[PDB]
Amino acid sequence: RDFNNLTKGLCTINSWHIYGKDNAVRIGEDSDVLVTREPYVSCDPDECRFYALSQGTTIRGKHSNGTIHDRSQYRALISWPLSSPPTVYNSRVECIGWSSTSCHDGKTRMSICISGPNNNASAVIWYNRRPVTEINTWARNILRTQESECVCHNGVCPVVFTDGSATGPAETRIYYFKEGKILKWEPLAGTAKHIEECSCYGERAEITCTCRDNWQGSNRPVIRIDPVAMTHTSQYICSPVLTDNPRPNDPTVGKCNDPYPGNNNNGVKGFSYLDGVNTWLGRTISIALRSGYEMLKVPNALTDDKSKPTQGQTIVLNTDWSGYSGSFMDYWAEGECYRACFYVELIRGRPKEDKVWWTSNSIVSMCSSTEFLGQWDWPDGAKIEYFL
Amino acid sequence: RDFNNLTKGLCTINSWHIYGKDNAVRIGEDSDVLVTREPYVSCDPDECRFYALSQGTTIRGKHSNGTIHDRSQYRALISWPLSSPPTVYNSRVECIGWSSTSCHDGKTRMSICISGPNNNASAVIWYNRRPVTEINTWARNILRTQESECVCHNGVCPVVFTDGSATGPAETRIYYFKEGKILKWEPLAGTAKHIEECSCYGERAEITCTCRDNWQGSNRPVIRIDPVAMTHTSQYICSPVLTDNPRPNDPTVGKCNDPYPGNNNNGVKGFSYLDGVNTWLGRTISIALRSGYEMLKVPNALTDDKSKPTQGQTIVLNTDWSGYSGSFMDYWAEGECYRACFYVELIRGRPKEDKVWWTSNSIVSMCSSTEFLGQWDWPDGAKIEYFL
Amino acid sequence: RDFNNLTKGLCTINSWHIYGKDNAVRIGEDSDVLVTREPYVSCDPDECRFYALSQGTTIRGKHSNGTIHDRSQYRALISWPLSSPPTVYNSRVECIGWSSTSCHDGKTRMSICISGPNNNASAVIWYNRRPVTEINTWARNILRTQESECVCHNGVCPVVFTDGSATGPAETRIYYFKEGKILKWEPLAGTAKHIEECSCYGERAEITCTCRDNWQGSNRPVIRIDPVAMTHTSQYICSPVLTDNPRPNDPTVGKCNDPYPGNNNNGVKGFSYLDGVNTWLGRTISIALRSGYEMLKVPNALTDDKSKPTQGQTIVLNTDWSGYSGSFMDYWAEGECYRACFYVELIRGRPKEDKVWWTSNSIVSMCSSTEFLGQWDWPDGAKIEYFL
Amino acid sequence: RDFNNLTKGLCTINSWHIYGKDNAVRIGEDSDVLVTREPYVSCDPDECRFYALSQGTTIRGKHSNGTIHDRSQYRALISWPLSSPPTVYNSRVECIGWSSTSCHDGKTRMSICISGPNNNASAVIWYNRRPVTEINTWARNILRTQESECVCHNGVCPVVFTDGSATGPAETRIYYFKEGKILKWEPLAGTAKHIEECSCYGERAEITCTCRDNWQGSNRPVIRIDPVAMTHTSQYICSPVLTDNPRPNDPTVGKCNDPYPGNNNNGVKGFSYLDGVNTWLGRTISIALRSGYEMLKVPNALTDDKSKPTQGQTIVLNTDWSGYSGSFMDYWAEGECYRACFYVELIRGRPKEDKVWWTSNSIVSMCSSTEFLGQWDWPDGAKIEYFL
Ligand SMILES: *[C@@H]1O[C@H](CO)[C@@H](O[C@@H]2O[C@H](CO)[C@@H](O[C@@H]3O[C@H](CO[C@H]4O[C@H](CO)[C@@H](O)[C@H](O)[C@@H]4O)[C@@H](O)[C@H](O[C@H]4O[C@H](CO)[C@@H](O)[C@H](O)[C@@H]4O[C@H]4O[C@H](CO)[C@@H](O)[C@H](O)[C@@H]4O[C@H]4O[C@H](CO)[C@@H](O)[C@H](O)[C@@H]4O)[C@@H]3O)[C@H](O)[C@H]2NC(C)=O)[C@H](O)[C@H]1NC(C)=O
Ligand SMILES: *[C@@H]1O[C@H](CO)[C@@H](O[C@@H]2O[C@H](CO)[C@@H](O[C@@H]3O[C@H](CO[C@H]4O[C@H](CO)[C@@H](O)[C@H](O)[C@@H]4O)[C@@H](O)[C@H](O[C@H]4O[C@H](CO)[C@@H](O)[C@H](O)[C@@H]4O[C@H]4O[C@H](CO)[C@@H](O)[C@H](O)[C@@H]4O[C@H]4O[C@H](CO)[C@@H](O)[C@H](O)[C@@H]4O)[C@@H]3O)[C@H](O)[C@H]2NC(C)=O)[C@H](O)[C@H]1NC(C)=O
Ligand SMILES: *[C@@H]1O[C@H](CO)[C@@H](O[C@@H]2O[C@H](CO)[C@@H](O[C@@H]3O[C@H](CO[C@H]4O[C@H](CO)[C@@H](O)[C@H](O)[C@@H]4O)[C@@H](O)[C@H](O[C@H]4O[C@H](CO)[C@@H](O)[C@H](O)[C@@H]4O[C@H]4O[C@H](CO)[C@@H](O)[C@H](O)[C@@H]4O[C@H]4O[C@H](CO)[C@@H](O)[C@H](O)[C@@H]4O)[C@@H]3O)[C@H](O)[C@H]2NC(C)=O)[C@H](O)[C@H]1NC(C)=O
Ligand SMILES: *[C@@H]1O[C@H](CO)[C@@H](O[C@@H]2O[C@H](CO)[C@@H](O[C@@H]3O[C@H](CO[C@H]4O[C@H](CO)[C@@H](O)[C@H](O)[C@@H]4O)[C@@H](O)[C@H](O[C@H]4O[C@H](CO)[C@@H](O)[C@H](O)[C@@H]4O[C@H]4O[C@H](CO)[C@@H](O)[C@H](O)[C@@H]4O[C@H]4O[C@H](CO)[C@@H](O)[C@H](O)[C@@H]4O)[C@@H]3O)[C@H](O)[C@H]2NC(C)=O)[C@H](O)[C@H]1NC(C)=O
Ligand SMILES: CC(=O)N[C@H]1[C@H]([C@H](O)[C@H](O)CO)O[C@H](P(=O)(O)O)C[C@@H]1O
Ligand SMILES: CC(=O)N[C@H]1[C@H]([C@H](O)[C@H](O)CO)O[C@H](P(=O)(O)O)C[C@@H]1O
Ligand SMILES: CC(=O)N[C@H]1[C@H]([C@H](O)[C@H](O)CO)O[C@H](P(=O)(O)O)C[C@@H]1O
Ligand SMILES: CC(=O)N[C@H]1[C@H]([C@H](O)[C@H](O)CO)O[C@H](P(=O)(O)O)C[C@@H]1O
Ligand SMILES: *[C@@H]1O[C@H](CO)[C@@H](O)[C@H](O)[C@H]1NC(C)=O
Ligand SMILES: *[C@@H]1O[C@H](CO)[C@@H](O)[C@H](O)[C@H]1NC(C)=O
Ligand SMILES: *[C@@H]1O[C@H](CO)[C@@H](O)[C@H](O)[C@H]1NC(C)=O
Ligand SMILES: *[C@@H]1O[C@H](CO)[C@@H](O)[C@H](O)[C@H]1NC(C)=O
Ligand SMILES: *[C@@H]1O[C@H](CO)[C@@H](O)[C@H](O)[C@H]1NC(C)=O
Ligand SMILES: [Ca+2]
Ligand SMILES: [Ca+2]
Ligand SMILES: [Ca+2]
Ligand SMILES: [Ca+2]
């Protein structure tokens, strides 16, 4: 009907309640479920769906041997109904590619998939389910994107891309689209040294994305965008409570405009909600590998380089695997504020579970509450040995 | 369009005709059917669906070993099309939890799921498919609810919860919701000593729920609610025709405001239609275990402590298993009265059938007729030995 | 929108073209297809669907052993999309029973299912998907109905039932319904001695049903109904070209008001289009068993007891099995006349193919053309030995 | 709503981007996917679907042994959702036959299927999903059609048929339909000697179809139609860059009105976009067999018998199988021109891969871009040995 505008603010978060859960690997043991990875959730004005990058095979199927690789001609962006598994018979294909992003603007939805060789990949922008715009590689080394949903304000929806090295300086750019057409684009600015896999949300005409520095830096990069003026800035989260993985241990003071040193050439997609005292950071529990997941209330994290934990909540125990995590919100829900949500990818199989030749994932999703609810941990459930 | 109001009365019941049947366990032998339990039926203005608490696995699947437990992170409230099985590809998820209730109000539908540990569980109320309200545990010992549908009158829909011991005094409360928001709540009143798993229906601006006393008492508790004034009372069904399971034998006189003694720490979810001479009680045939099912016309049951059977009808033979049973009606059907219906859960597997490692169920459903129709028995059908 | 009226006449038939085909048994070898029997086709204002009486099991499933029986608590009336198989995931249940009929009236659809023991069965009438009317057994010996679709004229839809013996005198009645309510009913009249499984169609405010005499009589009974006056008559098709199965050989002259003698206690559901010179009778090729199928132009069959074949067309070869057959037409298609159609059930398995423990069927359907098209035979396709 | 008119022109093509991909054979290894062949794509005003001629069996199913044959009573025209596999549970049947074509006109869609024996086949035309017109064989030797979609202009949609010999002179005719009714038909004209499997598109009130000469001729026949006047002409593509398969090698000069000699009794369905300098021809890489696929910019191909390659792009490598290819466009997309698309069938199994007893295919589809995007090759993916 009409373009949506970020008119409200974030509700206060005093705890988190379960929103959705897949149980995909448990069910996939005896069903026609698709091997996926790199998921997310995204809302429309009438329903919210689950999203993922398919591998073009069922888990129990023979072609699942070798699904440890990321880029192939047999991947695609698919969507399915909330808390149901990525079934072969109930899934809908958005576009063909091995990297992606998607978002609705009040009128219709825009989806972007990237495909191709390393020497020269390319992005195609779709809108109202028709292919509208195309963009070829600029720095000729794996053109990539968010891996989670974008946000729009009155028709304009910014998106972040990177093209170039993963263990050194790259070429990041913020593009501004309106009905699938490029309005403008500008290169990265600010003090952030490496950008990758941005997780974004919005409130009161502003967009905040917490991203990943894969080069060096256990603290996380941040990008604030102004959808009306079409401008931005970047920096790091000051707080000493580090959130990348892998990472060293938490210190007494942190860094605001420089990567905190300790581990190289590695990271993980993550997110956070930056709102003064109402600030919460998410992270794995293990400093060495992707296991466990926890949420932490760290007042004034982004601006205070000494801030420490006030309250917290456990999502997945440290004996249980996790993976990626990102942000989303239901911009079309009734209320006076925006209720914040997030998802956590639960990876099974290789590399850590190598008696199996595949790699796949599960999903758990939570949203905020204004009460102080009790906590419980939410693992995937599957017994790898039933697959031997 | 507009809120629904309990404007009619109950039609006269002279017999029951089949409404719906699943045949889930028969079909699940060679299909992708989900292991479920604790079912019910619920109507919308345009279609009536089947409901159940999934276990997150298919019957023939490996993860079905151990589905004898009730509370787990892998259960969910699902719905599917009438007289079809709970298939993996045709099911819709309402919310995440191990206890529940749901009902439409004329405009939209409200669903409630409860999840968490025993020390501290919590309920989340959803409306129009978005999470609106949250409630944490009050007495810190398994917060639980109806296990069947609620009833609404002009926007207000009462719901009964219990939190605390199952073999002693607990904390029951009636909550009044309007569009997912808590209007009010009040503690139990009247002479009923223990409340659990209420089965409710409505006619002429009043709501009657026949429940379960798991502490002591083979006779059943009753709760009458006034949706307009937001008040209630409780008591027991006077009649000597006992209906809980397990239970002792029928006596000559019964108890109106006190639990009839005989068996402890056990019961089963049940229901009844209380309407003077037009009164019918349902019950298993075996006094010791959940087998067989029969309907009995006992005039003035609730107020007469000597009332005895006038007419009856067999639903499931005593050589056949049954389980839970509850009430529902199609508030949007054409006519001058409300045609009363009920469902019976048919459990297969453990505990009684232990050559199998799972536990699942089937459904049969009937509604009333004004004629005196012939009777037939309706078992599940499956041969356990085809699963060995 | 508005009630439909039989306003047109039959187009001239000069040949038949394929309309639809299932290929169910071929596909069911490696799919979740349901064991069915007693099928038919029925149109709505917007789509035409396939219909059948399910057995509550998949073909490859264990519970298919013993599906040679007809009456059981696990059967149901289901419908699915045209030329697709009766799949477990794509089927819709109309009502519970082992005998049936259904038809749309311009506004909504009425469906009727019969269930129960032999001593006392009962029919429930549904309308707009809600159970409206009930009727108990009158002569206490297997109450049964059409096994194909009914026809309506301005809201009124007659239906034929039988209750009593199959090898002697019974109790037939024509019921007249309007929105699921009984308008009237009257007993059989005319010179027909035994009625069973009527196949009906309509044009110019009249309804003709060709039925089955299971007692004695290789020639077929006929019932003409006047939907406006609510009256009828019966008789036999005069022509010497006999069409029941089993049957003796064709003679030189036939019988108009008396069963032609030759074979007892046996028959098969069939049909015909009676329209003067534009008359066509259908029948199996073998006089002893259900094999092959052919259509024959026999001018003035119903009134001329000497009429013989003018033109013909082969549908299924005599080396291929067939079974039941019935009539249907698309009352909502554009044109100035009614294009006539029919279906043939193709049975596989027991009794003739006994290396398998089940019994199931396939469907082929044809409609008329005004040209003289070429012919081809349409078998089921499946190789029974792939099931061993 | 209203009839569609070819009002725009072709956008300029500077490269091709992926549109859709099936991955059917990879997935069919562990799923209920249907054995198909002879596919295509076709758009509606609201969605574009995939099309194919089914064989009436699943790939892993027993009835897949022998699917090397083309004409049988068990084939059908089916359609399914874009980039999803032809699943047994998600497919929709259009009509019954072993040869076909289909297209939407702005209001509704017309589909045509051909069935029957070689002595006398026949076509039935369907519209708005009801059978409207019938046509019997004229030259009594396999009546056949396009095997891809038709194009319409203000209600009129021409279609090309052939009936008669494949290795000598036949009887081709162009039919003009309007709402399923034959407006007119006329025999082939111009200098083309043999016509088969036409691939058509349209822009600015004209229809161009590049077809197949199976008799003699490695260069391709062309038919230009005037939808308003209902007339046409034929000829060959002049250019020396030959595109049929099998074929001899490319010469220095070509033939405009005569079949270029070299190989007999063989060909393959193909297409091309003829637009002056903006001209592109598609073809397999191997001159002997169906392997590899490439697109070539050959300015003024149709009129210049010396034209040679200016630019090109690889679609499938020569070590990978291909098959048929055809044209389609989204006539209802926003813009000022028509964005051109095409599909390539990827055949697996017999005849070249004979360790398997079946024959099936996969799909890849691309559309044009105005940028110069990078290229990648798109194979089917499946490992035949996982089927042994
Ligand atoms: C039934 O259910 C109810 C329902 O909620 C349960 O109640 C909840 O219990 C939670 C667990 O205790 C609790 O969460 C914790 O909150 C802390 C903050 O509170 C305290 O301090 C503030 C300020 O002084 C006070 O206001 C407050 O009242 C308290 O005093 C957090 O600090 C906790 O986090 C730390 O511990 C966990 C492990 O338990 C770590 O994973 C986490 O990362 C935190 O510790 C690391 O990080 C800090 C920051 O740099 C380091 O200083 C510290 O050394 C740790 O560092 C190591 O670990 C990380 C990760 O391994 C690594 O990178 C680093 O290098 C180091 O190696 C925790 O989040 C809830 O707040 C509580 N509910 C409420 C409402 O408060 C109830 O318990 C159940 N049972 C019953 C009977 O009810
Ligand atoms: C073809 O189909 C037709 C279609 O309907 C068939 O007709 C139907 O047949 C039914 C079965 O007989 C019948 O149902 C019974 O009705 C009784 C009431 O009728 C009589 O009394 C009244 C008042 O005097 C009269 O008006 C009426 O005319 C009759 O005289 C019920 O009382 C029957 O229930 C009792 O028996 C069944 C077992 O058969 C028990 O399961 C049931 O619980 C009842 O008995 C227990 O409970 C009472 C109450 O406390 C006890 O006193 C008694 O001792 C039993 O107690 C033991 O059992 C329970 C459970 O095991 C346990 O807790 C307790 O401790 C004890 O151990 C029964 O319901 C229908 O009414 C009839 N149709 C109609 C319209 O009436 C037809 O038969 C078929 N065949 C043919 C040829 O047509
Ligand atoms: C390529 O395709 C084209 C496309 O159509 C093919 O053309 C079609 O060919 C059909 C087969 O021959 C033909 O159908 C037949 O039509 C007969 C009527 O025509 C003749 O008579 C009339 C009047 O005199 C003339 O107008 C007309 O021109 C002809 O002369 C029917 O009579 C045929 O039916 C009989 O034979 C078949 C077997 O072939 C039986 O199954 C059938 O039941 C009929 O025979 C039995 O019944 C009669 C009636 O009582 C008995 O008298 C007779 O003895 C038989 O009885 C025994 O059998 C039954 C069943 O087994 C049992 O109950 C009984 O007791 C006995 O034991 C037949 O229907 C089409 O009409 C023709 N197309 C057209 C438009 O006409 C073409 O051939 C193909 N090839 C080529 C090169 O084109
Ligand atoms: C990273 O990705 C980027 C993204 O695009 C890559 O860039 C692209 O590279 C493509 C491959 O080289 C290239 O396509 C070729 O274009 C030729 C035309 O260009 C040249 O000539 C014109 C005019 O002079 C100039 O304007 C232009 O600048 C060039 O000089 C085509 O001619 C090419 O086709 C021929 O070769 C291929 C094999 O490679 C054959 O399959 C094809 O059929 C052509 O050759 C046959 O046909 C001709 C015509 O009759 C014959 O003369 C010739 O002998 C061949 O004949 C045999 O073969 C056929 C089939 O086997 C048989 O029937 C016959 O009998 C003979 O036996 C080719 O299409 C793209 O144009 C280029 N992109 C752009 C925008 O240009 C990049 O490379 C990647 N890497 C990096 C680092 O970036
Ligand atoms: C487009 C692409 O290749 N994305 C891949 C990125 C990429 O390698 C890093 O961002 C380094 O640049 O890594 C992740 P992970 O395996 O670390 O879990 C897998 C992704 O699929
Ligand atoms: C929330 C919960 O645990 N519900 C469980 C209740 C509960 O134990 C009783 O109401 C005693 O309080 O019992 C039944 P049942 O096994 O007796 O058939 C299983 C339920 O799932
Ligand atoms: C309601 C019912 O039992 N219908 C059955 C009738 C019935 O026995 C005959 O009409 C004799 O009355 O026969 C057929 P068929 O086996 O002969 O092919 C099977 C039906 O299912
Ligand atoms: C109606 C029909 O039979 N179509 C068949 C045609 C036909 O034989 C040729 O057009 C020669 O006339 O060939 C193809 P292909 O096998 O060559 O790949 C298979 C088709 O199914
Ligand atoms: C998977 O492939 C590897 C080589 O990639 C092979 O050695 C291994 O045995 C395969 N796994 C299975 C289960 O076949
Ligand atoms: C189920 O698990 C138990 C232990 O919980 C084990 O002893 C048993 O053998 C398992 N059943 C099957 C069929 O594997
Ligand atoms: C059918 O006839 C009645 C009068 O006989 C009329 O009201 C009705 O509208 C007619 N049907 C249609 C479709 O108009
Ligand atoms: C089917 O059941 C019969 C008895 O009804 C039994 O003898 C037979 O062996 C069973 N068939 C199969 C395939 O198990
Ligand atoms: C397929 O059929 C042929 C004969 O057509 C037979 O020889 C062959 O063994 C069959 N293939 C399989 C896998 O059974
Ligand atoms: Ca890092
Ligand atoms: Ca009790
Ligand atoms: Ca007979
Ligand atoms: Ca050729």
mmCIF file of all heavy atoms in Angstrom, chain B residues 21-36:
data_model
loop_
_atom_site.group_PDB
_atom_site.id
_atom_site.type_symbol
_atom_site.label_atom_id
_atom_site.label_comp_id
_atom_site.label_asym_id
_atom_site.label_seq_id
_atom_site.Cartn_x
_atom_site.Cartn_y
_atom_site.Cartn_z
ATOM 1 N N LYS B 21 -12.235 -38.145 11.742
ATOM 2 C CA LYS B 21 -11.352 -39.224 12.161
ATOM 3 C C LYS B 21 -10.033 -39.099 11.417
ATOM 4 O O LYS B 21 -10.005 -38.931 10.218
ATOM 5 C CB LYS B 21 -11.989 -40.604 11.907
ATOM 6 C CG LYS B 21 -11.428 -41.763 12.766
ATOM 7 C CD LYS B 21 -11.957 -43.121 12.302
ATOM 8 C CE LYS B 21 -11.549 -44.264 13.245
ATOM 9 N NZ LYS B 21 -10.090 -44.534 13.310
ATOM 10 N N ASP B 22 -8.954 -39.231 12.173
ATOM 11 C CA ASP B 22 -7.578 -39.134 11.715
ATOM 12 C C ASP B 22 -6.992 -40.333 10.966
ATOM 13 O O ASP B 22 -6.538 -40.196 9.822
ATOM 14 C CB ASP B 22 -6.705 -38.910 12.956
ATOM 15 C CG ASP B 22 -5.767 -37.775 12.804
ATOM 16 O OD1 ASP B 22 -5.874 -37.059 11.798
ATOM 17 O OD2 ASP B 22 -4.926 -37.584 13.702
ATOM 18 N N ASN B 23 -6.946 -41.482 11.663
ATOM 19 C CA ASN B 23 -6.349 -42.745 11.175
ATOM 20 C C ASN B 23 -4.830 -42.479 11.045
ATOM 21 O O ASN B 23 -4.160 -43.048 10.167
ATOM 22 C CB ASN B 23 -6.890 -43.180 9.800
ATOM 23 C CG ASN B 23 -8.342 -43.577 9.823
ATOM 24 O OD1 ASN B 23 -8.749 -44.437 10.579
ATOM 25 N ND2 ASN B 23 -9.129 -42.965 8.947
ATOM 26 N N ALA B 24 -4.289 -41.652 11.942
ATOM 27 C CA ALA B 24 -2.873 -41.260 11.915
ATOM 28 C C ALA B 24 -1.780 -42.323 12.091
ATOM 29 O O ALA B 24 -0.773 -42.282 11.391
ATOM 30 C CB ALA B 24 -2.654 -40.136 12.878
ATOM 31 N N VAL B 25 -1.948 -43.211 13.073
ATOM 32 C CA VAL B 25 -1.002 -44.294 13.369
ATOM 33 C C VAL B 25 -1.013 -45.359 12.267
ATOM 34 O O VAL B 25 0.028 -45.940 11.964
ATOM 35 C CB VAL B 25 -1.300 -44.917 14.758
ATOM 36 C CG1 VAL B 25 -0.310 -46.022 15.094
ATOM 37 C CG2 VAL B 25 -1.267 -43.837 15.823
ATOM 38 N N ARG B 26 -2.176 -45.591 11.640
ATOM 39 C CA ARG B 26 -2.294 -46.564 10.534
ATOM 40 C C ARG B 26 -1.479 -46.054 9.356
ATOM 41 O O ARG B 26 -0.699 -46.791 8.755
ATOM 42 C CB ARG B 26 -3.744 -46.747 10.053
ATOM 43 C CG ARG B 26 -4.496 -47.898 10.663
ATOM 44 C CD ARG B 26 -5.970 -47.869 10.290
ATOM 45 N NE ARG B 26 -6.147 -48.163 8.876
ATOM 46 C CZ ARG B 26 -6.273 -49.390 8.368
ATOM 47 N NH1 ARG B 26 -6.246 -50.461 9.160
ATOM 48 N NH2 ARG B 26 -6.403 -49.558 7.061
ATOM 49 N N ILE B 27 -1.677 -44.786 9.040
ATOM 50 C CA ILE B 27 -1.007 -44.119 7.938
ATOM 51 C C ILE B 27 0.475 -43.794 8.227
ATOM 52 O O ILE B 27 1.345 -43.850 7.324
ATOM 53 C CB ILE B 27 -1.795 -42.834 7.591
ATOM 54 C CG1 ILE B 27 -3.140 -43.209 6.979
ATOM 55 C CG2 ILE B 27 -1.024 -41.969 6.668
ATOM 56 C CD1 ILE B 27 -4.140 -42.107 6.989
ATOM 57 N N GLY B 28 0.764 -43.454 9.478
ATOM 58 C CA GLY B 28 2.112 -43.104 9.875
ATOM 59 C C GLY B 28 3.108 -44.225 9.734
ATOM 60 O O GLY B 28 4.315 -43.970 9.853
ATOM 61 N N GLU B 29 2.613 -45.455 9.538
ATOM 62 C CA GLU B 29 3.442 -46.655 9.360
ATOM 63 C C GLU B 29 4.276 -46.520 8.081
ATOM 64 O O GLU B 29 5.378 -47.005 8.016
ATOM 65 C CB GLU B 29 2.544 -47.900 9.249
ATOM 66 C CG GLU B 29 3.266 -49.279 9.326
ATOM 67 C CD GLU B 29 3.781 -49.814 7.985
ATOM 68 O OE1 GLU B 29 3.091 -49.655 6.950
ATOM 69 O OE2 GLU B 29 4.869 -50.436 7.971
ATOM 70 N N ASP B 30 3.731 -45.827 7.086
ATOM 71 C CA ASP B 30 4.393 -45.653 5.797
ATOM 72 C C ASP B 30 4.342 -44.193 5.310
ATOM 73 O O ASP B 30 4.214 -43.938 4.091
ATOM 74 C CB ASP B 30 3.728 -46.569 4.745
ATOM 75 C CG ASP B 30 4.525 -46.670 3.455
ATOM 76 O OD1 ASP B 30 5.736 -46.926 3.519
ATOM 77 O OD2 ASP B 30 3.957 -46.497 2.363
ATOM 78 N N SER B 31 4.451 -43.239 6.229
ATOM 79 C CA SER B 31 4.393 -41.835 5.846
ATOM 80 C C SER B 31 5.127 -40.906 6.806
ATOM 81 O O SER B 31 5.464 -41.293 7.938
ATOM 82 C CB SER B 31 2.946 -41.358 5.758
ATOM 83 O OG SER B 31 2.178 -42.188 4.935
ATOM 84 N N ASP B 32 5.295 -39.653 6.382
ATOM 85 C CA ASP B 32 5.970 -38.648 7.190
ATOM 86 C C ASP B 32 4.976 -37.928 8.104
ATOM 87 O O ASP B 32 4.637 -36.762 7.905
ATOM 88 C CB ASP B 32 6.753 -37.692 6.302
ATOM 89 C CG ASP B 32 7.816 -38.410 5.463
ATOM 90 O OD1 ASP B 32 8.206 -39.556 5.791
ATOM 91 O OD2 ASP B 32 8.253 -37.831 4.452
ATOM 92 N N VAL B 33 4.493 -38.686 9.088
ATOM 93 C CA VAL B 33 3.546 -38.236 10.089
ATOM 94 C C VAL B 33 4.290 -37.946 11.399
ATOM 95 O O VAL B 33 5.205 -38.684 11.781
ATOM 96 C CB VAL B 33 2.444 -39.315 10.289
ATOM 97 C CG1 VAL B 33 1.572 -38.978 11.453
ATOM 98 C CG2 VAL B 33 1.594 -39.425 9.048
ATOM 99 N N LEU B 34 3.905 -36.867 12.070
ATOM 100 C CA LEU B 34 4.523 -36.437 13.324
ATOM 101 C C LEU B 34 4.014 -37.098 14.627
ATOM 102 O O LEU B 34 2.836 -37.212 14.843
ATOM 103 C CB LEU B 34 4.339 -34.915 13.448
ATOM 104 C CG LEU B 34 5.065 -33.986 12.481
ATOM 105 C CD1 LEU B 34 4.525 -32.576 12.580
ATOM 106 C CD2 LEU B 34 6.533 -34.004 12.824
ATOM 107 N N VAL B 35 4.925 -37.501 15.500
ATOM 108 C CA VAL B 35 4.569 -38.072 16.801
ATOM 109 C C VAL B 35 3.917 -36.920 17.600
ATOM 110 O O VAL B 35 4.534 -35.854 17.747
ATOM 111 C CB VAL B 35 5.880 -38.565 17.554
ATOM 112 C CG1 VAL B 35 5.616 -38.824 19.047
ATOM 113 C CG2 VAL B 35 6.454 -39.816 16.899
ATOM 114 N N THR B 36 2.679 -37.089 18.073
ATOM 115 C CA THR B 36 1.980 -36.032 18.845
ATOM 116 C C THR B 36 1.334 -36.633 20.084
ATOM 117 O O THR B 36 1.473 -37.818 20.346
ATOM 118 C CB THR B 36 0.774 -35.425 18.058
ATOM 119 O OG1 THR B 36 -0.197 -36.448 17.799
ATOM 120 C CG2 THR B 36 1.187 -34.790 16.733
#
